[PDB]
């Protein structure tokens, strides 16, 4: 296999926004390790002239999720949202950064 181009580690929320604001297409995203919740992950996505942030939650069994559907890994959560919108307000499909 090859590594994933979307894991940025501990990049500040502000820097994620600065980086994603420069992206060409809506849906461009990255997964970052939260600085507010040690051990927690956040999903940053470009949409128009904004950058939306989604908190990656974990249920009682340790599965990850954003809304209702649960995933056994960040990898599956990410791939799922390439075909299903991450947003409740508009259609936003995840696309790898350029």
């Amino acid at each position: 296999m090859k590594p994933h181009p979307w894991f940025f580690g501990k990049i500040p929320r502000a820097k994620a926004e600065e980086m994603l604001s420069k992206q060409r297409h809506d849906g461009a995203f990255l997964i970052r390790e939260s600085e507010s919740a040690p051990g927690d992950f956040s999903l940053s996505v470009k949409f128009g002239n904004d950058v939306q942030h989604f908190k990656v939650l974990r249920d009682g069994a340790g599965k990850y999720f954003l809304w209702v559907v649960k995933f056994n890994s960040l990898n599956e959560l990410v791939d799922y949202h390439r075909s299903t919108s991450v947003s409740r307000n508009q259609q936003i499909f995840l696309r790898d950064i350029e």
């Binding site: 942030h53 989604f54 939650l57 954003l66």
Partner: peptide, 7 residues
């Protein structure tokens, strides 16, 4: 904050 309610 985040787009998805966190609690």
């Amino acid at each position: 904050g985040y787009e998805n309610p966190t609690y």
